[PDB]
Amino acid sequence: PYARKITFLGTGSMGLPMARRLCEAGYALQVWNRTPARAASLAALGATIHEQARAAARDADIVVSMLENGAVVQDVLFAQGVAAAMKPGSLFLDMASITPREARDHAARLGALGIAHLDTPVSGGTVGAEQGTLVIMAGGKPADFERSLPLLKVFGRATHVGPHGSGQLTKLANQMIVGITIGAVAEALLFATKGGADMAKVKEAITGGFADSRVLQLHGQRMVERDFAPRARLSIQLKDMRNALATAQEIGFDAPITGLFEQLYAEGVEHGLTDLDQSGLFVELASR
Amino acid sequence: RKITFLGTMGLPMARRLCEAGYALQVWNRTPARAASLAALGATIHEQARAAARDADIVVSMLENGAVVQDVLFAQGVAAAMKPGSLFLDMASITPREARDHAARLGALGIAHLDTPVSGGTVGAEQGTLVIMAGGKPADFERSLPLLKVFGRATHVGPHGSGQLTKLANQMIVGITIGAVAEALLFATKGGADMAKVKEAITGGFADSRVLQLHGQRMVERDFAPRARLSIQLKDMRNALATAQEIGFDAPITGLFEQLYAEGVEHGLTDLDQSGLFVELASRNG
Numbered sequence A: 001p002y003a004r005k006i007t008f009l010g011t012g013s014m015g016l017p018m019a020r021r022l023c024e025a026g027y028a029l030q031v032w033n034r035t036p037a038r039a040a041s042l043a044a045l046g047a048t049i050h051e052q053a054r055a056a057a058r059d060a061d062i063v064v065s066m067l068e069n070g071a072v073v074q075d076v077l078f079a080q081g082v083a084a085a086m087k088p089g090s091l092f093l094d095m096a097s098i099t100p101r102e103a104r105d106h107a108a109r110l111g112a113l114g115i116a117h118l119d120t121p122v123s124g125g126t127v128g129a130e131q132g133t134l135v136i137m138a139g140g141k142p143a144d145f146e147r148s149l150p151l152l153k154v155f156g157r158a159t160h161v162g163p164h165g166s167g168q169l170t171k172l173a174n175q176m177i178v179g180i181t182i183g184a185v186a187e188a189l190l191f192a193t194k195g196g197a198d199m200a201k202v203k204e205a206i207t208g209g210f211a212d213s214r215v216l217q218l219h220g221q222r223m224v225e226r227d228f229a230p231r232a233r234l235s236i237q238l239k240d241m242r243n244a245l246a247t248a249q250e251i252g253f254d255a256p257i258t259g260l261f262e263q264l265y266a267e268g269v270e271h272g273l274t275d276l277d278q279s280g281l282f283v284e285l286a287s288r
Numbered sequence B: 001r002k003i004t005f006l007g008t009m010g011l012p013m014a015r016r017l018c019e020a021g022y023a024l025q026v027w028n029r030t031p032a033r034a035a036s037l038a039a040l041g042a043t044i045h046e047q048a049r050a051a052a053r054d055a056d057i058v059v060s061m062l063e064n065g066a067v068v069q070d071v072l073f074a075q076g077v078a079a080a081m082k083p084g085s086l087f088l089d090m091a092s093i094t095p096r097e098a099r100d101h102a103a104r105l106g107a108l109g110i111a112h113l114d115t116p117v118s119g120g121t122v123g124a125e126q127g128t129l130v131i132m133a134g135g136k137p138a139d140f141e142r143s144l145p146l147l148k149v150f151g152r153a154t155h156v157g158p159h160g161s162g163q164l165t166k167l168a169n170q171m172i173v174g175i176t177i178g179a180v181a182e183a184l185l186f187a188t189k190g191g192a193d194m195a196k197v198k199e200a201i202t203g204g205f206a207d208s209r210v211l212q213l214h215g216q217r218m219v220e221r222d223f224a225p226r227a228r229l230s231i232q233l234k235d236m237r238n239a240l241a242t243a244q245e246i247g248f249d250a251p252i253t254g255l256f257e258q259l260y261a262e263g264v265e266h267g268l269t270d271l272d273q274s275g276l277f278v279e280l281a282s283r284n285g
Helices: A015-024 A036-043 A053-057 A070-079 A100-112 A125-131 A142-155 A166-194 A199-206 A214-224 A234-250 A256-273 A278-287 B010-019 B031-040 B048-052 B065-074 B095-106 B121-126 B137-150 B161-189 B194-201 B209-220 B229-245 B251-268 B273-282
Strands: A005-009 A028-032 A062-065 A091-094 A116-119 A134-139 A156-162 B002-006 B023-027 B057-060 B086-089 B111-114 B129-134 B151-157
Touching: A005 A015, A005 A053, A015 A028, A015 A036, A015 A125, A015 A142, A028 A036, A028 A053, A062 A142, A070 A100, A091 A100, A091 A142, A100 A116, A100 A166, A100 A234, A116 A142, A116 A166, A125 A134, A134 A142, A134 A166, A134 B194, A142 A156, A156 A166, A156 B194, A166 A199, A166 A214, A166 A234, A166 A256, A166 A278, A166 B161, A166 B194, A166 B229, A166 B251, A199 A214, A199 B129, A199 B151, A199 B161, A214 A278, A234 A256, A234 A278, A234 B161, A256 A278, A256 B161, A256 B251, B002 B010, B002 B048, B010 B023, B010 B031, B010 B121, B010 B137, B023 B031, B023 B048, B065 B095, B086 B095, B086 B137, B095 B111, B095 B161, B095 B229, B111 B137, B111 B161, B121 B129, B129 B137, B129 B161, B137 B151, B151 B161, B161 B194, B161 B209, B161 B229, B161 B251, B161 B273, B194 B209, B209 B273, B229 B251, B229 B273, B251 B273
Parallel strands: A005 A028, A005 A062, A062 A091, A091 A116, A134 A156, B002 B023, B002 B057, B057 B086, B086 B111, B129 B151
Antiparallel strands: A116 A134, B111 B129
């Protein structure tokens, strides 16, 4: 009841499958993006592509950013005049990974201009995107979140976590757990293996017990198959660790586990692992 | 057909055993547990050796390597065991302890399989433990009908490899516990309500059994022992000790042995393993 016109800004990692469920739900879609073949794939689904982002945004009820980071988001919104050009009553959904400090800052500026902001990061990777079974962690006002919810349901299950920046904060909690569990799984599988155990059987043995996790089943299988082709790059996980640690020092929180994991990931990017998948941390820990 | 338990999760497992049609013999240290088992049809013996005598399969649920040696070699179970029989060790023992027991019993004609377990009291009542077995393939095959009752067994390798997989298992569990704990505290300091973050988290890349079970306990601040914080620390140390026998470098596990040690020093030894949350929360005021 609040929204029919949707704009994407960027396509991030799962933009395409999300646009297709979007069109399939009968939303009309405008896009501004930087990559021709994705643009074509989107055009094929019915989306209208614009050369300038401001143009894509202007008539939108809901503008969804799938941009990379805080700087890019700032530039697009303000250097490129997206904010200036949005409708009154419209909503801006930030899905980009961005610091909760940045989310609160963007929420203040847009509010200055009569535009609502929620920060709505996702977990769930490629098939949650295709199946509409993402998990979405939202920061902002309850009324805005209800306004959002029908668009949100198309992508997965959304949960309202708190006020502006809360979604990004729940997002960094989720990346800490993913970033550490990755290393826990690489370290235990290597331990078992130096011990003359064979990785596949061990994984098969602990499946369905206390050691079981979405990280063991997804990244662990990639560890078993030495398949480190990037889906989310190792350097993205480093950034998630760094943002979590920057947030920790700002809110006065001591996080030693994540401190160890930032070092280990930092020790991976040097050593030329930037472009392996996040599970590529196995490689760092093998060589040792 | 004939099973013995040495020591007792053992009560719900014996329930299942007895229903499933097996005859059971027990040697127990705890009178109330012997009472319950008596109630199910188990015959309780005074001496470990008398309960082991006529068994096809003897299942050890003793505490540790010392105790299993004691019970086997000192109190004559090994000497007293049948010609065909099988010893299943579910005790927490090192892979070295288990290679050694495998050989001493092997010289007496007794088969040996190390079969530790993962899962809760809830897994044991509902028959859905996960079982990690080291030892000979034909032995494993002989044991399977039995292990099937408890849950789902996977033959991982030769003697000593169930205990290896169990240390690997306990490494992940113990690290995931701090990971979940630290993430929930971080979010809470940041303003977020813990229940809500766990709700949001569930179903994506961060979901695990640790979040679902121990994380619910952290959310409710319910740290009553189901497996004690002492045992998890011991697990890390076993793991680091084996790590060193095999030449392995484990810096993560190494950090967690530290965190669990600081926890035990700060009074928390008899909390649940989810109690490491209390340690990480103190450090943070």
